[PDB]
């Protein structure tokens, strides 16, 4: 409408653009942190099934756990660097958020103000305690690494 | 626990929102045909003025209509102006329509997915049906040139 509206409507299709691209780095960091949960997770799996089958090592399956140990130091590196560069993403992509939510804000919106509010608590909840696990599964992974000395 | 009744409350609020959005998106749709069918028919009005009234009249009423020509070409283009982020901003909606529809298939929301299909299904067949007034509107111009020429 006036100038101030044009300029509203001008930031809001530049904001829709950027959040069509921020929804989709969003969702590529969530199955992406997926994947490193999952990745893990079944690393952790076979090693358990290794241990499980205890006492009746062969060269074959040994010689797999020695790629999956060499594997694991690889993957360890990886995982950290990655960690890293996904957080670097989050922040990334917090700030997005937050200019989209400073456009929404001089906009006008108050239904999606309170509605990203609530995601934005719900969703911190979720990825803390996700996160968490997370760090807390490589940190038991690199402990069992250390002590396999002994 | 589960979320389903935080997502309950907020789609509540969504939906009441949205309800609010849809009674006035159906007064806003009906003040966007009646804006875009004045616009069409004045401008095949002074195109009609520009190719029939030509010297039945005296000079200084052609003066005066080639003067009014002039400026409300000037005043048209100024007008039209608003026109041209309409296609950018139906662009944006579509990819944003088909992304969503994508996403929701891809997250298997068979309610979000059915929402998001039919959501660019709508938003299609509504600019598509503007636009097919205006350009009925303008092959009724064109019949009328090829029969008045022939």
């Given at each position: 409408?006036?100038?101030?509206?044009?300029?509203?409507?001008?930031?809001?299709?530049?904001?829709?653009?950027?959040?069509?691209?921020?929804?989709?780095?969003?969702?590529?960091?969530?199955?992406?942190?997926?994947?490193?949960?999952?990745?893990?997770?079944?690393?952790?799996?076979?090693?358990?099934?290794?241990?499980?089958?205890?006492?009746?090592?062969?060269?074959?399956?040994?010689d797999?756990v020695w790629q999956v140990i060499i594997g694991a130091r690889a993957e360890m590196?990886?995982?950290?660097?990655?960690?890293?560069?996904?957080?670097?993403?989050?922040?990334?992509?917090?700030?997005?958020?937050?200019?989209?939510?400073?456009?929404?804000?001089?906009?006008?919106?108050?239904?999606?103000?309170?509605?990203?509010?609530?995601?934005?608590?719900?969703?911190?909840?979720?990825?803390?305690?996700?996160?968490?696990?997370?760090?807390?599964?490589?940190?038991?992974?690199?402990?069992?690494?250390?002590?396999?000395?002994?």
């Open positions: 409408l006036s100038s101030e509206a044009l300029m509203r409507r001008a930031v809001s299709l530049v904001t829709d653009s950027t959040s069509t691209f921020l929804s989709q780095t969003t969702y590529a960091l969530i199955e992406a942190i997926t994947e490193y949960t999952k990745a893990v997770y079944t690393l952790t799996s076979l090693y358990r099934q290794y241990t499980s089958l205890l006492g009746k090592m062969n060269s074959e399956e040994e797999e590196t990886s995982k950290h660097q990655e960690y890293l560069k996904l957080e670097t993403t989050w922040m990334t992509a917090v700030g997005l958020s937050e200019m989209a939510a400073e456009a929404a804000y001089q906009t006008g919106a108050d239904q999606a103000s309170i509605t990203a509010r609530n995601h934005i608590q719900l969703v911190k909840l979720q990825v803390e305690e996700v996160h968490q696990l997370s760090r807390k599964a490589e940190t038991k992974l690199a402990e069992a690494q250390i002590e396999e000395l002994r």
